[PDB]
Nucleic acid binder design. Structure first.
Ligand SMILES: [Mg+2]
Ligand SMILES: [Mg+2]
Ligand SMILES: [Mg+2]
Ligand SMILES: [Mg+2]
Length: 338
RNA sequence: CAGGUUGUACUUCUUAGAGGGACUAUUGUGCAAUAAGCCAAUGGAAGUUUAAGGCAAUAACAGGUCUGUGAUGCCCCUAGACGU
C-alpha cells in the first residue's frame, strides 16, 4: 500500500495561555538535526525547550529556560542563523533579542506604537523587520535603531499579520529570475512582495477575509497564504494573475509552513492540522485534529482546542503544533505501511 | 554581623507617571423558545455590577437654620440702647 499514518511522539506542557509562536533550530551542519526548540505564548513568555531522546513517558521534552519579558502577548518569534539569538514580537509595543543560553535580552527595540504581530529576521542578521496593527513594517538595526518604516503609498489597509524574507540560495550562481525579497500579508487580505529596498514589487488582493499567515517555500519560489478565507492559496513568484494551487482546509487557517524538504504544506486550522501535497492533485493527504490533553480534566472538556502554530524540525521529520490549551504536540510521519 | 565609601551600575523592595489587566473569560447543568440571564467548576492580584466611597431624578416634608454670612422683607431697640 504505502500510506501516511501520523504517529504521535510526545507533548510539551508548560505554557499558560495560547502558543502563538514556534521555531526549531537551524542545521548548523548540513543535514544534522538541531536539538533546539523555541516557542512563544500569550502568557507573555518565550520558551526554550530541552528536547528529549526517544521519549514517550507521556512527554517529548521539558522546559529548560523561560523568558520573563514583554508586558503583554508574544505574537511571533524569529530565530537567528545560529541557535543562540532570537527576537519576539509583542502587543506590549516592543520586540526582544534573546541570547539563547542566558535568559537575558540584551536589546529591546522600542518604537512601535500599536501591538506587534510579526518579527522578520534577515538572512544577513542585521535587518530586523516588524509588522503590527500600525499597518507599518519597521526596519531595525541589530542594535535597536528603528531605521525605516513602510510608507503610506506602500503599506496596506487594516493591520499586518505576518512578514517574512525569501531565503537565500547559497551557491553564487545567477540564482532565480526573482531577487530575494520579503512579502507581507495584511488583514485587508492583500499579499505584497517587497523589493529589499522597501519598494513595492507585487501587491495582489489575495483573499476576502483577513489573512492570518503566509509562508515561503525554502526555494523562495512559492508562497502559501490563508485566513478566515478558510482557503489556502499558494502563489508562484512568477505568473501571479492566479495562485499556483488552491486547497480548502476545514475552518480558518492560522499558520502555514512547508516542509524543510519533503514538499508538503502543513496548515494550522481551528480543527487541527491538515497536511497537503503539491506532488499530487489530491486535497488532504493527511489530517489530525487530535486535541484533548487538558481535556481529560474529569468533567472539564474543551472539545477541540485550535492550533496556533506549526513548525518542523531541521530535517523535516518531526512536526510541532501549539494549541489553545498551551500545549505543543509532536507528530512524526511513517509511510510504506500496509 | 554590623559601619563607611564608590560607581554617568541597577531596579525586586520605595516613589509615581505612561500603559497594561475583567469583559463576567473557558467548560458543563437550570433557564431556555431564540433570550436576558442564574449556578458550579478551572484559570486568575482580582469575579457579591471585584471592594469601599463621591456624585445623586420628578415632587415634597408649611423639616432645619434670619445666632455663619456686608443674603435680605417686615417688626423690634436707639445713648442710664437688644450698639459697642
Ligand atoms: Mg459601587
Ligand atoms: Mg437631594
Ligand atoms: Mg441663614
Ligand atoms: Mg448697656
Amino acid at each position: 500500500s504505502l500510506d501516511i499514518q501520523v504517529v504521535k511522539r510526545g507533548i510539551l506542557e508548560g505554557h499558560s495561555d495560547w502558543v502563538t509562536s514556534i521555531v526549531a533550530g537551524f542545521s548548523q551542519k548540513e543535514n544534522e538535526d538541531s536539538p533546539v526548540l523555541i516557542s512563544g505564548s500569550r502568557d507573555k513568555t518565550v520558551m526554550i525547550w530541552k528536547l528529549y531522546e526517544e521519549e514517550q513517558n507521556g512527554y517529548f521534552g521539558i522546559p529548560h529556560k523561560a523568558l520573563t519579558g514583554h508586558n503583554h502577548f508574544v505574537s511571533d518569534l524569529a530565530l537567528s542563523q545560529e541557535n543562540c539569538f532570537a527576537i519576539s514580537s509583542s502587543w506590549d509595543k516592543t520586540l526582544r533579542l534573546w541570547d539563547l543560553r542566558t535568559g537575558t535580552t540584551y536589546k529591546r527595540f522600542v518604537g512601535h506604537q500599536s501591538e506587534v504581530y510579526s518579527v522578520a529576521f534577515s538572512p544577513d542578521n542585521r535587518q530586523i523587520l516588524s509588522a503590527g496593527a500600525e499597518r507599518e513594517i519597521k526596519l531595525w538595526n541589530i542594535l535597536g535603531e528603528c531605521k525605516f518604516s513602510s510608507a503610506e503609498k506602500e503599506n496596506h489597509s487594516d493591520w499586518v499579520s505576518c512578514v517574512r524574507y525569501s531565503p537565500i540560495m547559497k551557491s553564487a550562481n545567477k540564482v532565480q529570475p526573482f531577487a530575494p525579497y520579503f512579502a507581507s500579508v495584511g488583514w485587508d487580505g492583500r499579499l505584497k512582495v517587497w523589493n529589499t529596498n522597501f519598494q513595492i514589487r507585487y501587491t495582489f488582493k489575495a483573499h476576502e477575509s483577513n489573512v492570518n499567515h503566509l509562508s515561503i517555500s525554502p526555494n523562495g519560489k512559492y508562497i502559501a497564504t490563508g485566513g478566515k478565507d478558510k482557503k489556502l492559496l499558494i502563489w508562484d513568484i512568477l505568473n501571479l494573475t492566479y495562485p499556483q494551487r488552491e486547497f480548502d482546509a476545514g475552518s480558518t487557517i492560522n499558520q502555514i509552513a512547508f516542509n524543510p524538504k519533503l514538499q508538503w504544506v502543513a496548515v494550522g486550522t481551528d480543527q487541527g492540522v491538515k497536511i497537503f501535497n503539491l506532488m499530487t492533485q489530491s486535497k488532504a493527504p493527511v489530517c489530525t485534529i487530535e486535541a484533548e490533553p487538558i481535556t481529560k480534566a474529569e468533567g472539564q472538556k474543551g472539545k477541540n482546542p485550535q492550533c496556533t502554530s506549526l513548525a518542523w524540525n531541521a530535517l523535516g521529520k518531526k512536526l510541532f503544533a501549539g494549541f489553545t490549551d498551551g500545549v505543543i504536540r509532536t507528530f512524526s510521519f511513517e509511510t510504506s505501511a500496509n
